[PDB]
Design a protein around this motif. Structure first.
Motif: not given
Lengths: 336, 336, 336, 336, 336
Positions: C172-194
């Motif tokens: 229910y309440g998890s932050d995907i933006a914190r769990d994927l900080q060190n895994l994905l690149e900064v530009d690829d993580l924004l495409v996942v967030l949107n």
């Protein structure tokens, strides 16, 4: 003495004699007889000729003798024959009315566990026979080169020999040298005989035959992907015969049964006096029978009718080889 | 004091000592002994030597002491020794006759849940051993180039090493450096030892060996599609050892058992006086035994006989490599 | 007033507070502690700290208050304090002795239904983690071109990110933006967030990466056939969290429980007077507990330890990338 | 007359009115409300608004009237109003205490049989929706030719239309012409409308679209192997709606229930006089309720929330088509 | 004499007459009637017209006559008509109250075992019909050459003929020469008639037709991989009709039933005198009915509605061949 290790040895001799009995596939008439109204009278009159009832005599006799000693001691304390320091060996039934459900559930669940293994074995054999049929059909349809007539004939001989070889591996006293006399050639059968793992040897023959076939690489990959079924079947059969149900799960059921039947005359004395002997007899013939059925059904392959299952594959490949010319002639006459 | 944390520590020491016991595959003679008439006498005489009965002493002693205190207090209130302000600690059995089925069903269902995990583990191992057999058979049949003799020999060495490596990963105290001494080369075994995930390392060896093989692309894709079985086996074993049955589902059974056995002397006092001690003893030895069997069977790999399962794959690949020349010579003589 | 919607709100607050608790994979020492002799004492002393007992207070208090009112009215009719027009509220237990089995079976079967969903979720995760491991292994072994180093590194980053992304979707309440900080690149993580469907977005990244890889068509088809596992896992998880057990099947169990516990003091008054209060207390704490365990286990993902399951895939791919050079050097020295 | 075929017709009208109710997928808040403490009060207050209780009135009224006639005749024989040739209609409860377990087990097993069909339907839909998602993802990633833009757009339109078309085939009164208005083109929807088997027609569209695509033969074979999922889903749904549970297995349960409830006042008269009316009422409201839940859950598709399952696939394909340009631009910037 | 082998023969004649009854697929209206309120009255009024009740007369009459002899002898010992050496044939019910659960569980588990076989048969047919549909769809989409019009038409004729041929193989008295009159050509039907294994013959036709098709090797391998479904279906059906449930597992249930019903009047005499006749009647009509349902459902194919399952495939292939030109014309108008 009849009870001094004589009944249990005769019971074992008869039980192992009944293991090696010829089984046949059910056809429709057998199913009619099975569903018939006379079935109950039949099963009654067939007892004293069945494995389960003949292997049930030792426990039921043992637990009836205990009840006779309990009864003949309680009857001696009343209308006293003996010094007044000996108490009546009686108890209340209320403790065993709160535990009967637990023993019932444990016995029935153990029997269901055993039937699960029976079903696993049946399905494993179903997939092996279906795969042997499908592989043989594909080899007949695919192999068309005139120069590979000799190897194709051999290739269809090793497929039919596989279910027989696997059946001799999971059945205690069978002769593979007699069952494969008319299937394999004299020189190929000696290579199978010298092997410790006969079905594994036949698989190696099939795999090597498929390499020397002048097929296209795509078609060879398609054909040799059907061998995986035989490996899976070998695996499942070996694990079902090697790895039984947990011994904890089985010794529990045995210990609980013996304890319940030893003290059952003591809780039942207070309401039925001397009627505890037949009550103990009936309880021992019912509860122990449920456990015995489960023990017999558990290594499942002696009661599956594998000879008719192998004969089916033999007959099907013979029929398919005989019907080839008619089918080819019928399909040749399409637009000409 | 014997009860002051002495019995529970001895019970745990003995229970963990019995976990690391050598298991063998059942053959036909073992099955004969299993189905025999003497089985009940055997299981009886084998108790006080089994994990389940030796780990059952603490609960049964604890619940028999409670019944002795209840009995010795109810016996003190009658034929009074104490002030008349203390009541008799008795009750009616009618509430527990409407709840016995629920406890019976909950215990038996928890034991069946555990047996399900046992079966899952057995099947996972069945598929891993079958797949190792099938991969090794295909590598022997497919790899034919004279220049890749050295890599093929290594490729068959990493397949046989996989079941051993997986067995050392799921068994608590085993030495993988001793089990793989005669299987892998001295330089390849050090790469496996430095790895945190040994079966994962052997899979990486097999995958890299299949790339350097001068195979056709279709045949290489066919061969490397068999590695997925080893991944699936690793997964299932890790999840079975990492993720137990719900703790809610287990603590429920434990709490219900303790509550039922604490108040059982109080409901049974009204009909059997002083016979509640043996009734409590029997109830605690039966109901707790059912739960204990289920606890032991639940992480399933210590009771599966994995050494004989790995030895089977070793023997089969040795036999297949020894029988290659005879089979090739027999199949060469087809029309010549 | 303590009972005026105060206990049920505190119970809910505590129950939801206990849902978001950190779980770890069992290792061998945890299994030792689980099988130990002290387990019963532990589970007892751990109550009033567990979800199931703290969420059981409202029903048990409600049904004990009813029994106190029934008892205090039957006690008022006897030794009369009130006009003689009021009858004694008593009945016979015989109707409820023929229906107890039905309620027991219905409760236990509902709990087994819930455990089935728990097992489904566990297996779904097992197949997702195994498939992520197998895909990553194949990508490491297959991708060999020097010009596709950059895309391969990204391709292995999206595989490790998939189990995390799926875990954030079912919790229910998890932050995907914190769990994927060190895994994905900064530009690829924004495409996942949107994206509204994050695991679906990562699958689209993997599929597009496999097209731009200069592989042979056969090898590309082999590699992209492993994505189907991630679709199947997404499906099963979404259906397990979206589609609960039939509400008819659940409201039946609830209604039957409430009716049985309301009239239980009336059938039990005739034999135990004033002992119906503790009998009602015990019945409500046992039968309602069985139902509560089943309700908690039913959406299965909050009690599965997904963080350690994702960390396993991360660690395995890091280890496989680190061990590549040693394995390649060892396999290069075969005949040279 | 209220009982003269008025209650059973109103019950049927209400029951069929409640079949066509809108269902939604559970999210996390719904799960919170489901697990909450107030659930029991909710289910109570929700009765007289549920299908199962409103369809239970005829049987319970019928069996309460029988008990009132039995009671009013036994009360007439005592304190006699009638000639002394009429006996008291009473019996012993001992025969029904040995058969209660059998009826309990038969009812609960029939309900579990029905839940099995519910689970089968849910899984079938899970695999259909997962496969539609995976096929659409692969078509987006694979189809790259500029000249096949028009056919690709159509190809993705027939995938999203398949779950809707299948949902209209298994739901009694739905309009497929309204659900597919915005999905298919005006000319393609008329070809679907003229067909007797709409999902079969959409499959034929997808298969013909995949032939006219200028793909490589390997890639076309890979793409068209995903259609088999839609066939399997159609099959399973048709068989679940066409082939119910054995009518023998259902009429048994019905006959046993009616016989048990007709003679229940006669066995219960001897201990509770005139209390047999409420006992019969409770027994008929509990045992018949268990059977009714099972009857309702058995054709499973009216209670599965298929509209949100189809909308999910629609949304996912829209999101994947919108996110294509960003992903391609991100993956293009790898080393440049 | 009515009881002298007259009732059991009439029962068998009627039972076998009811086996060959026409079954239809359920549509939505049938489901409405099934779920309706009038269902209980219907099932009651439908008895004396059902297989299960008409095949239940012999056992119930036999066990009611035994109870009448027991009763008429106990009534003769009291108010004595005979010499005082004959005792009263009475006993205690306490032994049978601790064993009732075991018999209940054994009967219900045997019935569930039979329903498992019913489900296996239904699923096997589901996969065969789905596969025939999918193969026919792929052949329509794939075969495009103008020169292979004649063989394609034949190829679609052998697919539709396969489910019929398999249905005639598993149904006792059916004429395959009448069911295939309008499906196969006159010359191809004679080749099928001369074969011992008709479905095996049709598979050989399909396999040989796929070789003479001028397809690419990849496409031919894809098409001929769909034949494996027909082999698997043949296998499962043959094993379900050849290999019944263990005879030990069935004779146990029969023997236990007969023993329980023979001595039931003796344990019930002590509380209900002369009411044992109707109690025995009801027990024999309930417990024997549960067993009979299980016996009937066990070879599953006479109660599956296979004619409508085959007709579905026939209709679907006709509809797909008729809709080809419209779909091709609609897809041709994409960008032109």
């Amino acid at each position: 003495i009849s009870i001094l290790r004589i009944i249990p040895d005769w019971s074992d001799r008869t039980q192992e004699r009944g293991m090696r009995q010829h089984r046949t596939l059910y056809d429709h008439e057998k199913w009619m007889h099975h569903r018939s109204s006379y079935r109950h009278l039949r099963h009654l009159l067939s007892s004293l000729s069945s494995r389960v009832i003949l292997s049930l005599i030792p426990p039921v006799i043992a637990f009836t003798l205990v009840a006779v000693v309990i009864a003949s001691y309680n009857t001696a304390v009343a209308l006293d024959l003996l010094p007044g320091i000996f108490p009546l060996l009686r108890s209340s039934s209320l403790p065993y009315q709160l535990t009967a459900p637990a023993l019932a559930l444990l016995l029935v669940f153990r029997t269901e566990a055993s039937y699960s293994r029976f079903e696993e074995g049946r399905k494993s054999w179903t997939e092996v026979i279906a795969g042997a049929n499908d592989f043989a059909r594909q080899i007949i349809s695919s192999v068309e080169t005139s120069g590979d007539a000799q190897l194709k004939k051999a290739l269809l001989q090793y497929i039919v020999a596989f279910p027989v070889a696997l059946k001799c591996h999971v059945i205690y006293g069978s002769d593979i040298a007699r069952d494969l006399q008319n299937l394999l050639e004299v020189d190929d059968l000696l290579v199978v005989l010298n092997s410790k793992h006969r079905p594994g040897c036949i698989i190696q023959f099939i795999s090597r035959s498929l390499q020397l076939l002048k097929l296209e690489e795509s078609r060879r990959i398609m054909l040799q992907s059907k061998i995986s079924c035989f490996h899976e079947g070998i695996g499942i059969c070996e694990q079902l015969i090697g790895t039984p149900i947990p011994l904890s799960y089985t010794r529990l059921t045995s210990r609980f049964l013996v304890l319940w039947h030893l003290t059952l005359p003591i809780i039942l004395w207070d309401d039925c006096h001397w009627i505890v002997v037949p009550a103990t007899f009936i309880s021992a013939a019912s509860l122990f029978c449920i456990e015995q059925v489960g023990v017999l059904i558990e290594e499942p392959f002696p009661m599956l009718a594998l000879d008719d299952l192998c004969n089916s594959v033999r007959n099907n490949v013979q029929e398919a080889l005989a019907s080839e010319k008619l089918i080819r002639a019928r399909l040749a006459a399409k637009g000409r």
